[PDB]
């Protein structure tokens, strides 16, 4: 058999002592291949929807405890899928701040680390990204603000407000 | 932009780890931002054999060329560019095998094992019991002779 599933690593909060530079949360996205197990990538449940990279499910359903779940929304291009509604993640960093990354790699516990995001040039026109390195199956993992938010997924970009 | 670049020849190896040119070759996937890997395969022929799930049968670009699927069956989970699947052999069913694994951003590896046989519907095959971080699979599983009796992943057909 095979199957892609979902498990819940925690809440999405921040955190002040960190280290500087349906129901919602992270949850670890998984695939079971006959005899092995892996984390493929990470993604945010929030408001009954599941946000995670296009590249980690390529849109297949999930099974959620003993529910599925249905790709809702997605873009290829940007990368991005949701499940269940519309995308919900409006947020945006300041292109300034510092931000805190909510680590959830594969076989280790979640985490937040704190980090100044550096900026790329792009097409139209230039974005935050996270500078650090984590095992394949990383990705989407959440950046949050200060207030708690969700700016964006690791190993993409976080959209600048100004 | 998803494509392909070559990771190694596929060649057993003795002293090992134990329990269009061809070759074995990375999948990845150019994200906006950096790069990343998403399955191996195997050019064998002229014939580009990877795992459906790892594509979805996406085109693929290779140098300045670019490969597009030519056999597909997703049950099997299995995929073959520019001609018929080619890869025939099949496992003994007692004897140990060799994956060549070409985990992400790391050099590849033969490592040599003897497979589980899991119970499927209809009726039983062989299966690799180790663990690699994701977008390895498809990687190449080697018999003693050299030769591509499955895909990690996939596990290996038994002869008898």
Redesign the interface.
Known sequence: S?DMYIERAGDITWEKDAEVTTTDGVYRVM?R?????????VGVMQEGVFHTMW?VT?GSALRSGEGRLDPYWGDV???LVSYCGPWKLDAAWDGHSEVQLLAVP?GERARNIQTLPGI?K?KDGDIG?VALDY???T?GSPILDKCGRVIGLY???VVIKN
């Open positions: 095979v695939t291949r006959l005899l092995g197990s892996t984390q493929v990538g590249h390529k291009k940007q990368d594969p790329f792009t990204a095992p394949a199956g990705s190993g993409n970009g």
